[PDB]
Amino acid sequence: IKASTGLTGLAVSTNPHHTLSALYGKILRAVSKMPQDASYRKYTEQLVKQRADSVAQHKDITALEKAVGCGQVEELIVQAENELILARKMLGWKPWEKLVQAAPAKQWDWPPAQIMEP
Amino acid sequence: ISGKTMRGGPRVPKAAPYPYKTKKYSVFNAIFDKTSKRFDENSKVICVEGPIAAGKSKFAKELAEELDMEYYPAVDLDLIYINSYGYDMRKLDPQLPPSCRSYDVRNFCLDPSHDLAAQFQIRMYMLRYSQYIDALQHVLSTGQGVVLERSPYSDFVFMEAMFRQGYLSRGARSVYNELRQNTIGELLKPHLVIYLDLPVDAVKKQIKARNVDYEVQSKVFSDAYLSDLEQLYKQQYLKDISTHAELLIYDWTAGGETEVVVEDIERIDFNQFEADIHNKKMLDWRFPLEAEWCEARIKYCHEKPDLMNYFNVPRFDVPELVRSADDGKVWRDVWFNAPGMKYRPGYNADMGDEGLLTKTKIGINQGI
Amino acid sequence: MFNNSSKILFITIMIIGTLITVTSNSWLGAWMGLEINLLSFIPLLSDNNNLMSTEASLKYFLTQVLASTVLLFSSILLMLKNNMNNEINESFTSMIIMSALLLKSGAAPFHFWFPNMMEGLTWMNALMLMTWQKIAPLMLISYLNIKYLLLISVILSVIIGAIGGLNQTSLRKLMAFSSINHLGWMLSSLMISESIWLIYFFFYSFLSFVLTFMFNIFKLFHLNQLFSWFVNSKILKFTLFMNFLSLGGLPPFLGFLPKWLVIQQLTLCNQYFMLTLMMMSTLITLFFYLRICYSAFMMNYFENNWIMKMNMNSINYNMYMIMTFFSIFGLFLISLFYFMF
Numbered sequence: 062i063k064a065s066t067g068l069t070g071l072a073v074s075t076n077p078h079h080t081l082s083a084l085y086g087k088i089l090r091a092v093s094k095m096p097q098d099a100s101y102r103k104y105t106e107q108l109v110k111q112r113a114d115s116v117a118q119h120k121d122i123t124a125l126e127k128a129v130g131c132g133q134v135e136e137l138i139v140q141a142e143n144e145l146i147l148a149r150k151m152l153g154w155k156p157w158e159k160l161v162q163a164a165p166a167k168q169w170d171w172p173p174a175q176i177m178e179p
Numbered sequence: 180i181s182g183k184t185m186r187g188g189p190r191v192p193k194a195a196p197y198p199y200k201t202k203k204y205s206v207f208n209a210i211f212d213k214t215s216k217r218f219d220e221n222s223k224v225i226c227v228e229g230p231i232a233a234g235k236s237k238f239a240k241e242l243a244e245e246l247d248m249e250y251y252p253a254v255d256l257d258l259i260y261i262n263s264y265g266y267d268m269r270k271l272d273p274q275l276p277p278s279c280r281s282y283d284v285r286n287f288c289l290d291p292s293h294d295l296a297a298q299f300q301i302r303m304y305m306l307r308y309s310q311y312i313d314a315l316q317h318v319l320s321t322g323q324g325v326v327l328e329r330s331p332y333s334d335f336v337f338m339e340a341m342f343r344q345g346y347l348s349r350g351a352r353s354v355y356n357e358l359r360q361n362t363i364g365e366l367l368k369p370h371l372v373i374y375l376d377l378p379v380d381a382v383k384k385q386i387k388a389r390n391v392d393y394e395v396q397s398k399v400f401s402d403a404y405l406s407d408l409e410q411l412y413k414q415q416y417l418k419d420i421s422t423h424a425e426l427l428i429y430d431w432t433a434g435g436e437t438e439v440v441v442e443d444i445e446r447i448d449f450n451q452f453e454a455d456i457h458n459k460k461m462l463d464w465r466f467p468l469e470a471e472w473c474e475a476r477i478k479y480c481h482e483k484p485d486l487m488n489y490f491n492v493p494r495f496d497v498p499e500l501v502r503s504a505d506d507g508k509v510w511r512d513v514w515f516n517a518p519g520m521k522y523r524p525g526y527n528a529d530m531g532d533e534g535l536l537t538k539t540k541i542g543i544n545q546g547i
Numbered sequence: 548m549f550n551n552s553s554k555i556l557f558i559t560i561m562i563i564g565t566l567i568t569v570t571s572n573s574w575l576g577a578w579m580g581l582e583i584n585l586l587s588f589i590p591l592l593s594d595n596n597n598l599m600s601t602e603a604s605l606k607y608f609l610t611q612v613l614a615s616t617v618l619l620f621s622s623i624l625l626m627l628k629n630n631m632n633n634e635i636n637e638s639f640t641s642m643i644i645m646s647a648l649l650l651k652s653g654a655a656p657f658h659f660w661f662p663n664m665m666e667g668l669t670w671m672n673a674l675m676l677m678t679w680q681k682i683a684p685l686m687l688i689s690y691l692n693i694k695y696l697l698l699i700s701v702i703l704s705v706i707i708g709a710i711g712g713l714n715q716t717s718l719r720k721l722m723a724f725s726s727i728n729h730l731g732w733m734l735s736s737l738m739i740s741e742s743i744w745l746i747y748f749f750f751y752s753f754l755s756f757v758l759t760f761m762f763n764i765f766k767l768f769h770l771n772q773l774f775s776w777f778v779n780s781k782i783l784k785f786t787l788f789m790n791f792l793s794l795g796g797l798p799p800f801l802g803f804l805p806k807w808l809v810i811q812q813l814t815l816c817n818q819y820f821m822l823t824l825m826m827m828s829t830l831i832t833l834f835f836y837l838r839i840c841y842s843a844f845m846m847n848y849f850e851n852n853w854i855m856k857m858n859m860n861s862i863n864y865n866m867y868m869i870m871t872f873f874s875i876f877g878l879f880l881i882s883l884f885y886f887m888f
């Protein structure tokens with residue numbers, strides 16, 4: 062077993078597969094509640110399922126690390142947890158809807174303060 | 180505080196639990212056995228609140244189920260009327276009508292106009308308060324976490340609520356209000372408090388789904404009464420707990436997803452709170468030394484009688500709280516002559532106990 | 548041994564300190580033991596849990612410390628001008644030593660600290676001050692032999708000791724006044740003889756020990772609490788309360804046995820007038836004890852409603868009412884005591 066995570070605070074965590082699996086399940090359900098025509102949904106399943114499908118083939122934690130890339134398991138679980146909070150907040154945010162506000166004319170125009178031909 | 184699901188299995192007690200149910204705790208015993216040795220992560224109290232008919236009993240059951248604490252069922256007013264052989268002293272009819280005949284939550288809901296209702300109004304606080312000490316007993320002995328559905332700390336909400344309705348007396352409001360201080364000072368506030376928040380209409384929807392012939396058809400259920408819970412919870416009850424215990428408020432149980440509640444609680448850690456001791460939050464749990472742990476432990480495993488005896492408060496200035504002497508005398512005659520009350524529990528050989536003529540044992544805080 | 552383990556330690560050091568005094572050979576050694584008592588007792592008295600305990604601590608310390616200061620000082624003078632511990636005769640050298648000791652044990656003119664104490668003290672802490680913190684100064688008073696000062700103390704040891712007791716409604720202050728009266732009897736008894744004084748204190752220790760030890764049990768702190776304290780039958784409410792009359796030592800209560808012993812030997816000394824006064828005041832002592840026993844002699848009073856059951860410790864209750872039963876039927880043991888001859 063690796064002695065240290067190389068980072069302060071980030072401690073070595075056992076049963077990573079169980080934790081990663083459990084995290085992937087919850088986020089999948091969290092996106093399950095989403096509407097079926099949300100781009101955020103469309104991609105999270107394929108990404109998460111790709112991860113949650115890679116979780117199994119590599120019993121060795123180091124083997125899984127290489128297979129999944131993207132960093133070490135210790136951070137990787139945190140990545141998953143972050144996204145759990147994202148989905149719960151995302152459902153609460155309803156960002157799949159259309160534009161709340163149209164920018165006023167000449168808002169995002171650079172350079173500023175130049176007369177124009179109508 | 181941490182869920183079994185993230186443990187990938189069950190939690191273990193760090194050391195052999197102490198048989199506090201069946202054994203007495205001595206200061207000699209404190210010297211002979213250390214206290215915080217058993218203590219672990221989950222050694223904390225998660226109190227629940229919500230407007231009435233919030234169905235939180237199933238919530239707390241599952242929450243303690245999948246975080247590995249004790250459920251500690253809710254108020255059981257009947258236990259006054261229950262004995263070693265079960266039967267209800269409510270069975271005893273109005274032989275002594277005026278202030279000896281019973282009054283359960285049914286009677287309250289049927290009619291809160293009866294001055295005798297004030298009886299349980301305070302005895303109900305005692306039941307909560309006695310339960311709370313039971314929870315502290317279980318914590319300090321086993322080190323295992325606990326979850327009480329409701330607390331004596333919160334009981335005054337209903338108290339001021341009923342009084343605002345007018346049901347209690349101006350006298351009784353003073354009695355209970357001052358008397359809380361006497362005992363309520365002697366309890367540790369919970370680590371974490373979870374309050375559930377439906378509107379008055381919404382709870383009326385669910386209480387009509389409870390279909391209780393002594394509640395749903397009753398008349399107490401005015402918006403004002405069931406709303407006074409809301410205001411009192413919102414500001415009066417919450418704030419002091421908001422000072423000591425960490426406060427989480429989701430919308431309610433029904434939409435309250437257990438797993439996210441599990442995760443939100445687990446995310447809220449307290450090692451973060453292991454900073455300056457003088458901080459007022461978590462204050463009632465900063466035990467410097469193993470000796471001070473044992474002081475708290477012995478104080479609950481060996482002074483529950485002392486805890487009960489705080490209630491001995493003399494107030495003969497309230498008529499509904501006074502009892503008629505001769506009637507009360509008969510009320511004594513009924514109870515201790517009625518089946519299964521002549522002796523201490525286990526010595527009511529008239530009702531069946533055997534092994535007497537040699538048995539001389541008595542249980543820790545065994546009632547009497 | 549109330550809450551912590553340190554209670555055992557300080558009690559032990561206290562015992563050693565006081566035991567030094569009673570076994571002390573010279574005034575200095577006795578002073579040494581007294582201060583050790585001063586140390587060992589302050590922490591027990593000054594619980595850190597509440598407030599009232601702490602204020603009692605300054606008053607106890609700020610009084611005892613001066614008492615020890617004066618005691619040693621007057622010792623040096625006596626044991627200078629006489630160049631010997633046992634002076635040939637009692638002069639002005641010696642009255643100061645009693646005045647030290649009388650304050651230390653809380654005797655008649657020097658008592659005001661003692662009621663103010665009781666507010667702070669809890670029960671067994673009070674108890675422990677009541678019984679044991681009065682041995683050493685009294686046993687020293689034995690060595691001092693000034694008749695008239697003890698006599699003025701005995702005269703005034705009951706007057707205030709009972710008149711105040713009439714007035715108090717806090718059980719803490721009543722025990723103070725009750726003992727100051729009883730302390731009147733010890734002081735007279737020690738002026739007469741010591742073996743009888745030893746006996747009388749012991750029975751007083753026993754009686755006060757059982758008394759406050761139940762008040763600790765049920766935590767009854769105010770006359771209202773006594774009237775309100777639930778008992779299942781309101782008969783043991785009355786059987787247990789006989790001891791309040793054993794305070795007055797009325798024959799069928801075993802408090803008579805010591806009072807009889809002191810009276811017998813005292814009148815044998817022929818100080819009849821003194822007996823009359825103390826014994827007149829004894830009635831006032833017993834008077835407010837009946838004022839206490841209105842709670843139990845009659846039965847079936849008006850009570851609070853919420854209480855349904857009453858509970859207490861096994862150990863304390865098991866010990867307590869064995870001591871009570873003796874307070875009930877103690878006399879017939881007339882034979883068992885052979886220390887009076």
Ligand SMILES: Nc1nc2c(ncn2[C@H]2C[C@H](O)[C@@H](COP(=O)(O)OP(=O)(O)OP(=O)(O)O)O2)c(=O)[nH]1
Nearest residue numbers: 231232233234235236253284287300303334337394
């Ligand atoms: N007078 C008075 N009644 C109370 C108090 N607390 C609760 N109750 C009464 C009101 C309720 O009709 C009844 C309990 O019903 P609940 O709403 O708590 O049922 P719930 O669905 O919450 O599940 P549970 O009670 O935990 O089994 O007891 C109180 O503090 N004072």
